[PDB]
Amino acid sequence: MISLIAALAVDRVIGMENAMPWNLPADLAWFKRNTLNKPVIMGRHTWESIGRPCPGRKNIILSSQPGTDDRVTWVKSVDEAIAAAGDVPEIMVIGGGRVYEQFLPKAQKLYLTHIDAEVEGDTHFPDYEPDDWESVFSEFHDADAQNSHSYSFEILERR
Ligand SMILES: NC(=O)c1ccc[n+]([C@@H]2O[C@H](COP(=O)([O-])OP(=O)(O)OC[C@H]3O[C@@H](n4cnc5c(N)ncnc54)[C@H](OP(=O)(O)O)[C@@H]3O)[C@@H](O)[C@H]2O)c1
Ligand SMILES: CN(Cc1cnc2nc(N)nc(N)c2n1)c1ccc(C(=O)N[C@@H](CCC(=O)O)C(=O)O)cc1
Ligand SMILES: [Ca+2]
Ligand SMILES: [Ca+2]
């Protein structure tokens, strides 16, 4: 299946000036745990903010232009992106804004981190209805030494 994984703040803010504006180690671990051994799909701007392939995962980058780095697999369309992922149980779509928008109607699961931080973004997660998504897991955690904000993990399954 196709799954989306994303950290959101207030107003579903996901990013600002090509970066993510918070400090949350608990989220990185959760991300690593749910994506390791999976193919990961991302847009070119998200690729350019990471710059090294996500190790232990097949890396597929969407771009309308020819690839500029042979450590990763480049694809020119959403259908080419899914085909390059081959026959796996779960393909992870990991950002950014424009990529989430395109894959959201094809997705069966969402893994979300709701971070209780009020920041300004120039990129937002698509608007999603509970009419379509059932919550099968959610945990809330208070801020601590490593994590400056409270945050909750949730897994939703399409209805
Ligand atoms: N909060 C999170 O969990 C999270 C996760 C990841 C990223 N982010 C943030 O999201 C922001 C980047 O988001 P973004 O929406 O600007 O960019 P993005 O979605 O990462 O990348 C957009 C680019 O991807 C390519 N692309 C997307 N769809 C394509 C398609 N269907 N066919 C061909 N190319 C396609 C295009 O590249 P060309 O111009 O080369 O054609 C497009 O300009 C950053 O601030 C990043 O930090 C947040
Ligand atoms: C820019 N970016 C995208 C990113 C970050 N956190 C996310 N968190 C969630 N929940 N969802 C995402 N899509 C997501 N995406 C990043 C930034 C750093 C690393 C990163 O290097 N993660 C390490 C974890 C260990 C470390 O950060 O040093 C890894 O190897 O997976 C990955 C993606
Ligand atoms: Ca580097
Ligand atoms: Ca059902």
* Residue ranges of domains in the chain, CATH in brackets: 1-159 (3.40.430.10)
φ and ψ at residue 44, rounded to 5 degrees: -65, -35
Rounded to whole angstroms, how far apart are CA atoms 85 and 96? 18
Rounded to whole angstroms, how far apart are CA atoms 118 and 99? 23
Distance 49 CA to ligand 3 centre (A): 10
Question: Whose alpha carbon is nearest atom 14 of ligand 2?
Answer: 6
| Residue 67, preceding peptide bond in cis (omega within 30° of 0) | no
- Cβ-based neighbours of 139, under 8 Å, separated by 6 or more: 152, 153, 154
Which atom of ligand 1 is closest in space to residue 121's alpha carbon? 45
Distance 100 CA to ligand 1 centre (A): 8
**Tally of CB atoms within 10 A around 57:** 16
Distance 62 CA to ligand 1 centre (A): 8
CB–CB of 108/92 below 8 Å?
Answer: no
For residue 57, give the nearest of 90, 24, 30 by alpha carbon: 90
Rounded to whole angstroms, how far apart are CA atoms 105 and 158? 10
Residue 27 among known ligand-binding residues: yes
Method: X-ray
Tell me, using a 6 A CB cutoff, whether residue 113 lines ligand 2.
yes
Q: Reduced to 3 states, what is the DSSP secondary structure of residue 32?
A: helix
Please tell me what resolution, in angstroms, this structure has: 2.3
φ and ψ at residue 130, rounded to 5 degrees: -75, -10
For residue 81, give the nearest of 137, 42, 53 by alpha carbon: 42
Question: Whose alpha carbon is nearest atom 7 of ligand 1?
Answer: 96
Q: Name the one residue in this structure whose structure tokens are 């424009």.
A: 98
